[PDB]
Design a protein around this ligand. Structure first.
Ligand SMILES: NC(=O)c1ccc[n+]([C@@H]2O[C@H](COP(=O)([O-])OP(=O)(O)OC[C@H]3O[C@@H](n4cnc5c(N)ncnc54)[C@H](O)[C@@H]3O)[C@@H](O)[C@H]2O)c1
Ligand SMILES: NC(=O)c1ccc[n+]([C@@H]2O[C@H](COP(=O)([O-])OP(=O)(O)OC[C@H]3O[C@@H](n4cnc5c(N)ncnc54)[C@H](O)[C@@H]3O)[C@@H](O)[C@H]2O)c1
Ligand SMILES: O=c1ccn([C@@H]2O[C@H](COP(=O)(O)OP(=O)(O)O[C@H]3O[C@H](CO)[C@H](F)[C@H](O)[C@H]3O)[C@@H](O)[C@H]2O)c(=O)[nH]1
Ligand SMILES: O=c1ccn([C@@H]2O[C@H](COP(=O)(O)OP(=O)(O)O[C@H]3O[C@H](CO)[C@H](F)[C@H](O)[C@H]3O)[C@@H](O)[C@H]2O)c(=O)[nH]1
Ligand code: NA
Ligand code: NA
Ligand code: NA
Ligand code: NA
Ligand code: NA
Ligand code: NA
Lengths: 338, 338
């Protein structure tokens, strides 16, 4: 199929582009490079084994979006582009609402214009809000995200939903991601955050590479087995595979298809640190700090629905996630070149 | 004060502009005329007793918004512009999210740019969602609006809220309107909907003027005193007065000030019809039809908060509301001239 992948040069997108190309789809990447570098492109094509076309630009430019859609006779769009720094979203809300809400709105508006009616959206478990019921199941009604970031994600799911209702021929997948981690097995592609990483695995990786002193474990008095926060981590490669499958099987299947994409099990901060210590050959330094604001104690996904309906489940393990991350970190300590 | 009134040529805005001018404020109206005519301008100035400056343009044009804000040294902005047809929003969601969500976002983004930090937003009781508790009090957590229109309104309250948190010096009023009706006492300004009116009072007015055959009373088996829907109707002139007061007293008062603006009591469809029959001198024709989709049975506002904090309460009665509407309808059966 002909697929426009917005945000395709980013962490999740890049990996999905590789898998998509491997499956012989024709890929057009649209990215504004605010959070990635063009240097990943050649790696995508090399690992993907096929050339993806790149367009530098912004989802907020509806005229441009429409043109690209027509120009490349796109059949489906996978929308990864947007801003995702939680803390920053609290500090700079407008930028999050503009990039994510308006951003998606302009993009689907262009779709409408170009008659494209297959969409896949990067959503998040944040949409479940403060749910005491765990694991989270797609049948639960959504809650109230606590950051502008989370809210922006739920707002898009809602706009997408109403759109589908008004244009019943569209197929729209709402893919709720849990905690993505890991890197391509070759060690040549991975997450390349700039500055202080906000997430656990890259932070740990930077501590391990010798960039940072110690990992601050936010909180150690949670009502969990070891006192540390519990989440569901999923390898970026499994996530990527899930996007290809969802794109392939839901195309032209009218409806709003909501799927949690997770491993279906939780791991605590210590579990993750321990796996990384083992992958890198040395104990990861860390200490306990206070709980981070807005942090829930424990949650993971119920991913039976996607197993049942899409025949998709994760196949990589936590140890792989850590190993693969270390291999990339270690092979490319400066990330992608400028 | 120097005030930009977006949507100022519309029903509610026009009336508020008149009151604002009467209080000696300097008014700049920004309107795209998608739902009003320039012919109201001269009436505003005449009834307002002072000239308001008019700018034809769209809230979605952030560059223009910023310019106007700077150019007129605006101190506060009252935001009435947007789309409000509920049923249409179900049919055309994107247009509602673009005009209302993106629309407001571009507008406050321009404010940020021009250093303007006092805002008043036209919100709605729709934000309370399907609340069994009535009357609705600002202390209730919001619910889930059932139309794209309602959702768009709640999304804006949320974005506004996060913005204020990030820019604590702003004063933002969230004015939740109930059911506005009525017209200026002179009979020369009023609501001038194009096509089939979606709301009760103008529909009744058109039936009375001889334009329509009979009023369809949506539903007659509600758990109410007479079987018909119950709402809180408020005269547009009281609503207008409330906006001047809120603007005057909340300016430069940091915070997100949420106020319900209603009469604080409910009236059924029959009560309204009966008042209109009495105002127009003839029985209004009507019949019972099925319930309209998404219609709640009975609700009204608890307006004690605004009484307490702003010393504002309604002063016009239901009979006035009907009388004033008939007087305008009857004096200007073709509305404002093209
Ligand atoms: N990584 C996570 O932990 C996480 C979990 C939940 C959901 N998500 C969502 O998944 C998607 C992918 O996240 P990621 O980890 O790969 O992040 P990323 O930062 O690596 O990729 C985002 C891509 O979007 C581009 N972009 C941003 N705004 C744009 C705009 N207006 N126009 C065009 N391109 C723009 C960036 O330059 C970037 O390459 C994002 O929507 C994110 O919110 C990710
Ligand atoms: N009338 C009601 O029953 C009701 C109750 C709840 C809330 N509201 C809100 O109150 C505000 C005023 O409603 P009203 O009854 O006066 O409606 P209105 O249609 O009379 O006024 C809206 C004004 O907005 C202008 N406008 C629309 N989109 C614009 C845009 N993008 N750029 C610039 N101008 C634009 C229109 O041309 C118009 O004159 C609206 O936000 C409405 O959603 C009204
Ligand atoms: O330096 C760090 C980073 C993380 N953690 C802990 O590691 C876990 C995972 O934290 P991340 O920041 O890696 O990811 P989150 O679980 O916080 O992210 C999830 O929760 C967020 C809540 O705002 C968003 F919704 C986000 O999209 C969603 O994936 C949490 O227990 C966190 O407290 C640390 O102890 N130290
Ligand atoms: O031709 C009509 C029009 C209205 N009604 C009845 O009159 C009452 C008032 O109806 P309106 O359409 O005038 O206004 P609403 O109460 O429906 O509007 C309120 O409810 C809406 C719910 O979608 C929005 F939230 C809107 O902003 C909010 O003011 C309701 O009981 C309605 O069923 C009729 O019987 N016949
Ligand atoms: Na429809
Ligand atoms: Na960064
Ligand atoms: Na680098
Ligand atoms: Na801040
Ligand atoms: Na109309
Ligand atoms: Na007319």
């Amino acid at each position: 199929m002909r697929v426009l992948v917005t945000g395709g040069s980013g962490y999740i997108g890049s990996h999905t582009c590789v898998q998509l190309l491997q499956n012989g789809h024709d890929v057009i990447i649209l990215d504004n490079l605010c959070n990635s570098k063009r240097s990943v492109l050649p790696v995508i094509e090399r690992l993907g084994g096929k050339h993806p076309t790149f367009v530098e630009g912004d989802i907020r430019n509806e005229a441009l979006m429409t043109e690209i859609l027509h120009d490349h006779a796109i059949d489906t769009v996978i929308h990864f582009a947007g801003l995702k720094a939680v803390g920053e979203s609290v500090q700079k809300p407008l930028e999050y609402y503009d990039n994510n809400v308006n951003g998606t709105l302009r993009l689907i508006s262009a779709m409408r214009a170009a008659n494209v009616k297959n969409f896949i959206f990067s959503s998040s478990a944040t949409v479940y809000g403060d749910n005491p019921k765990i694991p989270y199941v797609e049948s639960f009604p959504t809650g109230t995200p606590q950051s502008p970031y989370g809210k922006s994600k739920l707002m898009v799911e809602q706009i997408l939903t109403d759109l589908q209702k008004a244009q019943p021929d569209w197929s729209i997948a709402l893919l709720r991601y849990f905690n993505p981690v890991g890197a391509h097995p070759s060690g040549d592609m991975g997450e390349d955050p700039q500055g202080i990483p906000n997430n656990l695995m890259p932070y740990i990786a930077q501590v391990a590479v010798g960039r940072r002193d110690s990992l601050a474990i936010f909180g150690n008095d949670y009502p969990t087995e070891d006192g540390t926060g519990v989440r569901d981590y999923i390898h970026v490669m499994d996530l990527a595979d899930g996007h290809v499958v969802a794109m392939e099987k839901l195309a032209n299947k009218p409806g709003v298809h909501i799927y949690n994409l997770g491993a279906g099990v939780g791991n605590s901060v210590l579990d993750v640190v321990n796996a990384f210590s083992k992958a890198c050959g040395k104990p990861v330094n860390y200490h306990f700090a206070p709980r981070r604001e807005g942090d829930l104690p424990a949650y993971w996904a119920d991913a039976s629905k996607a197993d049942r309906e899409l025949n998709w489940r994760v196949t990589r393990t936590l140890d792989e996630m850590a190993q693969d991350t270390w291999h990339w970190q270690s092979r490319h300590p400066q990330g992608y070149p400028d």
